[PDB]
Amino acid sequence: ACGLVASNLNLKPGECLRVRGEVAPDAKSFVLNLGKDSNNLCLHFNPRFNAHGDANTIVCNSKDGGAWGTEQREAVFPFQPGSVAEVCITFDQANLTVKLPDGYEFKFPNRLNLEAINYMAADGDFKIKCVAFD
Amino acid sequence: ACGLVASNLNLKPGECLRVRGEVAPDAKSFVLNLGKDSNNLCLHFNPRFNAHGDANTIVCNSKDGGAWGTEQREAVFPFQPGSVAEVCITFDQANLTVKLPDGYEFKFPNRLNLEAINYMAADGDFKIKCVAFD
Numbered sequence: 001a002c003g004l005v006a007s008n009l010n011l012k013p014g015e016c017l018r019v020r021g022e023v024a025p026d027a028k029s030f031v032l033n034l035g036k037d038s039n040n041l042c043l044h045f046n047p048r049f050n051a052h053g054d055a056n057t058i059v060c061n062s063k064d065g066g067a068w069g070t071e072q073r074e075a076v077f078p079f080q081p082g083s084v085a086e087v088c089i090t091f092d093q094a095n096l097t098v099k100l101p102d103g104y105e106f107k108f109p110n111r112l113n114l115e116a117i118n119y120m121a122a123d124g125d126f127k128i129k130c131v132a133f134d
Numbered sequence: 135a136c137g138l139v140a141s142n143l144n145l146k147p148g149e150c151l152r153v154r155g156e157v158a159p160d161a162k163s164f165v166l167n168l169g170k171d172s173n174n175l176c177l178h179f180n181p182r183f184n185a186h187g188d189a190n191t192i193v194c195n196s197k198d199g200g201a202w203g204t205e206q207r208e209a210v211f212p213f214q215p216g217s218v219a220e221v222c223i224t225f226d227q228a229n230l231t232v233k234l235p236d237g238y239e240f241k242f243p244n245r246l247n248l249e250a251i252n253y254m255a256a257d258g259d260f261k262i263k264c265v266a267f268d
């Protein structure tokens with residue numbers, strides 16, 4: 001990850017992680033990775049503007065002991081290149097909930113059954129400006 | 135260390151790092167470390183409420199290639215246990231400038247001559263709630 005990497009987050013169920021960043025004006029893609037560590041991700045969150053044969057599609061996946069799971073593709077894309085976006089993430093036993101710009105929301109199963117999020121990494125065309133824990 | 139650890143900050147000269155956190159009601163001390171990595175710190179910032187013989191004193195130092203430099207104490211102590219505190223940090227070639235609650239500002243010489251600040255770690259009796267880069 002070229003972007004910010006943070007560990008020892010100690011984010012517990014029902015706590016809200018808010019991340020605000022700048023989307024590059026020539027953005028192709030960006031990634032937010034969340035989990036225990038780099039090899040154990042409960043959420044790989046990958047908005048693709050124009051990358052890997054995908055246009056304006058959010059792709060999500062998990063990684064378990066180094067092995068990627070099966071990707072899920074979402075139905076909404078409320079990001080624009082060249083703009084500031086905020087993403088809010090919370091989790092419980094069964095699901096991660098991601099709240100996006102403009103009132104959009106989706107869920108992704110908690111496949112690792114993690115009880116804390118301790119690692120966050122960003123990559124691609126997204127510059128983090130603010131991180132907050134509520 | 136036990137607190138938040140962040141890398142790839144890419145904080146450049148003139149940019150502001152703002153960190154806000156909760157100081158435990160029974161706080162003895164907390165640490166914020168900034169630099170390149172855990173062996174190369176341009177600033178080790180250590181408010182002692184009651185620790186290692188010292189009361190209501192800010193200790194600062196650097197660490198270069200694993201070796202602690204010459205420690206310095208500041209006279210002002212604008213922290214209270216059991217409250218929220220924000221510290222703002224910026225640097226240039228000559229100095230770090232640390233702005234504290236209640237308006238107090240001090241400079242600490244930049245002994246490492248780093249191009250950017252890429253590493254931050256918090257430790258002790260301070261829970262990070264928000265970090266911002268501008």
Ligand SMILES: CO[C@@H]1O[C@H](CO)[C@H](O)[C@H](OC(=O)c2ccc(C)cc2)[C@@H]1OC(C)=O
Nearest residue numbers: 163164165180186193194195202205257258
């Ligand atoms: C001269 O002893 C050292 O002085 C140094 C400054 O010159 C450091 O402050 C160091 O403490 C620490 O690195 C540290 C780390 C974590 C926490 C919670 C507290 C202190 C240590 O102080 C002592 C006594 O450890």
